[PDB]
Amino acid sequence: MIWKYLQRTNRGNIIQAGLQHRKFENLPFKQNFDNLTKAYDLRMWYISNSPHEAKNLEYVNELEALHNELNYQNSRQFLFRTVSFLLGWALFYQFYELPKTYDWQDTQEPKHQVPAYGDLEEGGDE
Amino acid sequence: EMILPHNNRQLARQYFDSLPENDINRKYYEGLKYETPKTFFGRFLNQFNIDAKLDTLSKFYTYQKTIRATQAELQEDRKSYLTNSLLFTAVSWFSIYQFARKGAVLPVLREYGRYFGTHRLFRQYLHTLVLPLLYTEYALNQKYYTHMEHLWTVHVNRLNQKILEDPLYTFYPQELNVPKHNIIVPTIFRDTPQ
Amino acid sequence: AARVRTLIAAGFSKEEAEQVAWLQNHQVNGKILGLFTGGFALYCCNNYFHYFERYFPRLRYQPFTKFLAQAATVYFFFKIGDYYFTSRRYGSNDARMNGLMYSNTYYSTNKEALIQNFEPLNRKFTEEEVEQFLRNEGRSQEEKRNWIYNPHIHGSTEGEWKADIHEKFDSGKAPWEREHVKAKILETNKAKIDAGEEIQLKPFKTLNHLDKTGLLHRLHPFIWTNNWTLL
Amino acid sequence: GFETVVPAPPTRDDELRMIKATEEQFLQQPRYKLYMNEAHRIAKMNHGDRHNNIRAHFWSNFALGLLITGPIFIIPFGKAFRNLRSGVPYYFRPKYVFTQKNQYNQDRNWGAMKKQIPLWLGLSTAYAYWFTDFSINDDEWLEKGKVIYPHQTIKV
Amino acid sequence: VCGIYVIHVIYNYMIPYYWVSTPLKNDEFTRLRMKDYIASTVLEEVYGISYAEWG
Amino acid sequence: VFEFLFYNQQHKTRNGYFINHDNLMLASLEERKKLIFYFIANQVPEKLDPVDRVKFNEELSDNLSTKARLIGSLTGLIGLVGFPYISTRIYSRPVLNIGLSLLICPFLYYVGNQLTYSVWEPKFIANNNTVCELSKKYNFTVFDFAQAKKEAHLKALRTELVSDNLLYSPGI
Amino acid sequence: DPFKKVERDYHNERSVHKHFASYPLKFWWGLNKFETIQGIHSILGNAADLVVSTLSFIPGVQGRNNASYIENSIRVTRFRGFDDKTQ
Amino acid sequence: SWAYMYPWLKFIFRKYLDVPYYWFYLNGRELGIRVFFTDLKLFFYGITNRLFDFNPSSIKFEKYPFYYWINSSQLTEFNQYRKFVIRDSIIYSLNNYII
Amino acid sequence: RDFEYNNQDVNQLNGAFISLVEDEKIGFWVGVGGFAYSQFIMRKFVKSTNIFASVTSLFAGAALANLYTHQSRASYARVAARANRNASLALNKLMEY
Amino acid sequence: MDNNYHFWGNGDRQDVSLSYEDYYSILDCLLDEKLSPQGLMKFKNLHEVSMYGVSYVPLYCFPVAYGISHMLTGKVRRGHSGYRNLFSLMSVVLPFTCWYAYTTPIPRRLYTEIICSNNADGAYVRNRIKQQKPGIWRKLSQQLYNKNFRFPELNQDLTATEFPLDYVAPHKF
């Protein structure tokens, strides 16, 4: 019976998957990033798998328009997220008790601070 | 540190010598074991003895480093928490008064209470005055209850063994400290026979 | 079939664990062979149980009787295996047929030697024995230890101390073989001797009475599987 | 850290016996066991034997983990490549080379394999390191580095 | 040929040099002896004597 | 492969037979002495003087050894409710009912005995004044515990060895 | 007489202590081999300990002390090293 | 701008550089990948403990000067740096000043 | 004096024992909850005798408790087994004559 | 529960946990003169395991930082095209993820045997951490007292006649 679970392969693993229709049934009444990405991916898959030409070229033009719109949406997302990240970084370092209590031994080299070989580097003995 | 036995002013012993014969500390000196309350309610009733235990230790161990640090930390935390509670109460009262002057009243409690029929505004003022104090007491009691429980366990343990000297980190004032002898005449130099 | 690892989990050396494992293996393997032969017979003679419905019609009309008969046959083969392995079945100590289980001589002799010669310590180790055990740490190596005498840590004199440590460590004498230890053991366990109970001095050594090969009992090994000759 | 009794210097017979033991131990060495004549030769050969035992166990466990981890982990992992986040079926998004994914499921299969084979080997390696006992050669206090001699190995 | 020689130099001159960098409590002399042996006993500097009648 | 059926299994999970060095590896000195004395007294009573053997046996019977048997008997009686399980006007099945009772009642006895031990044995070891007194009196060591473990395992093996021929042991 | 059962008697140390009738009646003790039965026993013991504590509010009965190493160790190591092969 | 973190760069790889050859038989340990996976598991356990287990409190005394300048006593075993006797004297003087 | 157990074994056993005790408490509560849930489910939807329902509920609760506690129990079992083996070997070496 | 429970660099769930940073700080308050050869061996094994671990820690933090950096850029996967922003945000965030990882205590048998040992080496290590690393010893003692460890150096000692050297955090009695 082991073969029935090892040799046999799930149908979905072999055949091309269809649409996840649940993601196209209830859509928000917005031109938001999610709907724009869904439309972009639909048109891209169509032009990747369809043998027709006029519809494919219409979808190419609409895909360029969607690329511009999605670039605008990504610009807004990037601006908001990065500004929030920088502000949170600054506020964290304002409210963080920065530890100014680390060992300073690295800044001290007495043998070099007071030259141990006093004048002995300036000519030998005899 | 270690105050030498001949240099050890047994100040604790002095305070133990002035203690009344009925004082529980003397009972500890006789071997009265002290066990931390392990029952919730008991711990509750033990959370109000923090200041009494701290005062007893301060009289016993006035110059112990840990005892002095505990006193200073408890005093500063009490002052800071009291100031925070009073500022929160002042802000709450000011906000409630200024918003109620323009009709706005926060609907947290019932408009008219049971029994006496006090108003929502009055009960809000009372709650904003009382509850911050309760939370301040709760937090201070938690922290310094564990700390003072450990300190008092140590105190009772060292009383049971009749140890009336001063602890390892007692720093006396300058009037109770031995001055250092500066004059140290080195031994006369002498050629070694060998 | 006694899980030598588990035996070492209890107080047991590797060799003693092997011997006890072999003994329990003999027992349980006899019983297991009996069960497997019994289970194999039912796999083939369950039609025999249906065949005997003419001499014993109770089997046909009372199916529970058939189940009881099958269980009885299973137990019968179980007992046959148990007898063939866990019974005495005394046989000659001969080299031509030892090992081959025409007799149960190996298991019987090992079981008898274990049961006869096994007795608990009947006491507790004295402080002199316990201190000796703590001083027996890794000093039983092949290279004998060089014993150096220090008067300030050993006391006594060199002549007395050298013979003392020779008896304690080098001679191989066990702590319970010392006169002082025996006297203290007799004194401490006086109550026990007040009951007429003898006190064991030597802790029971399993390796002196159990042997898979049977060389302790001078059992001649199987001649065709052994190059050497015993006794 | 006590000392042992230092024996007297060996006689000619003892020297000959230890010479014979060293000869036998030298003859026991295989030709493919390339260990030079050194004081640590026997210790290194024992270490190599233990390492070979550990290696055999590790590779058996690695093959077993390749057998096990796939259908449990990697094959269901492929189920994550049937569709995209937006729900549209998987298609090809090129990076630079616009490869002609003309075959049936070429794009999905190649993307899934690129994500799976590294994951497959990584999970199999984690399994092999998890279920292999390295206690054969491990020495916490490095007491196995003691020099062992050929004449000590064999008694004549 | 250069790279095989360079690899041979890297094998016994650089990496061994990076091994011991601090004073050692146990068998420091033996460790330094190993480090120096793998670098100072190269046949290129010792092999000439076997064929000395040439020169 | 059925050693759990035809071998002795009742002594393994009670009377401290499970106590091993791991326990003593974490116990305090007094707790270690208590555990070692309990194991020795339960498994190898030969190491104690007869008076102490009798005292410990009495205490063990009062707390664990006999209380467990009583509670197992109570559970068996619970299993005896309606002993003619399968009976009617026409037929009462004697062999069937007897087999059902002899399979149910010992199982419930075992369940009750195991429950009693699992509940009261740790409390008996920890909080028995007689056990504490005798452990302080004897002060067995780790060597004593190891020797007693060997003796206990050998005695448990001996119990099965002697009971190998219960039907015909001529001795030849 | 309890003393008669503690006397050191050679014969008493090598005689049959478990006869045939004791083998079926005690054969159920091998179920401890199974971790499922061990878990059943652990659950029953812990429930009984909870009951014993709740009724140990009554004087004269002592509940389980969770700070006692001996109690905890015995409770959690009763089935620590079970092995049906041995003995 | 990351140039002056080269001591951090050296640290890890300078530790790596001092690992001797395996078959020179100095320790016989090559615990790279083993430590990789073991520390992966250890970090899983550590994060789980830091999230859903006991975490030590960081509360400390904040208002007593030089409180954590602890001078040697019987509680500290006197195994400090030898020339810290001057430090102990300074600590004693500072405490006698602040009492 | 007395025999001293190896300190590393003591520390490992201490950790394993702490884990075992904590998981034993949590797993007892898990087993009680699993028994209750199995009994509820079997009374709601399964049509069988109360004896069968109760035995199945008890077995399900025990199985859930063991599943929760298996890691700690097995880790402690192996740590204790190795500690006992090491201690037994050391003591047998000391006491062998 | 791995098969290699004997490994010194390994550990169980309830072993003594030390964050890498703390470990390195612990190395700043010790001397090899005061330690026995066995303690030195323990510290050498810990050093080997710790150097490998601190090498591997950023890698463990890479997937988390990689995910966080992408989420900061937005909901667009510009692989090979958003590399500039992705890796700038990584050079920011990966230090933070590694900060969290390095400040997170991890169990280890070497940690539990170096600190919690009865011998003079362990006593010396505990006393040095107590005196020269007050906060590290404070949190370590809070951790140890919850693991059924009783030492004279712990601040949570109820059998001591000398007052604790540091604040005692709340805990169950």
Residue numbers in the entry:
A (entry chain 6A): 1 to 126
B (entry chain L): 29 to 222
C (entry chain I): 21 to 251
D (entry chain T): 2 to 157
E (entry chain M): 111 to 165
F (entry chain R): 2 to 173
G (entry chain Z): 4 to 90
H (entry chain C3): 496 to 594
Copy the relevant paper text.
Tetrahymena thermophila, a classic ciliate model organism, has been shown to possess tubular mitochondrial cristae and highly divergent electron transport chain involving four transmembrane protein complexes (I–IV). The energetically favorable oxidation of NADH or succinate by the electron transport chain (ETC) complexes I-IV (CI-CIV) first establishes a cross-membrane electrochemical gradient of protons, or the proton motive force (pmf), which is then utilized by the complex V (CV) to drive the synthesis of ATP1.
Tt-MC IV2 + (I + III2 + II)2 is a ~8 MDa megacomplex encompassing the entire ETC of T. thermophila. Tt-CIV2 serves as a central coupler in this megacomplex, with each protomer associating one copy of Tt-SC I + III2 and one copy of Tt-CII. Moreover, Tt-CII participates in Tt-megacomplex formation in contrast to the mammalian case, wedging into the gap between Tt-CIV2 and Tt-CI MA toe. Three main interaction sites can be found between Tt-CIV2 and Tt-CI. On the matrix side of IMM, ~200 residues on Tt-CIV2 COXTT2 N-terminal (NT), previously invisible in individual Tt-CIV2 structure, is now resolved as an all α-helical globular domain, fitting into a concave surface formed by the Tt-specific NT loop extension of NDUA3 and the C-terminal (CT) helix of NDUCA2 belonging to the γ carbonic anhydrase (γCA) domain. The third interaction site on the IMS involves COXTIM5 and COXTIM2 of the Tt-CIV2 small TIM hexamer domain bridging over to NDUTT12 and NDUTT6 of Tt-CI. Taken together, structural symmetry between two Tt-CIII2 protomers that was broken in Tt-SC I + III2 is now re-established in Tt-MC IV2 + (I + III2 + II), suggesting the functional restoration of the electron pathway from the distal QP site to the proximal QN site.
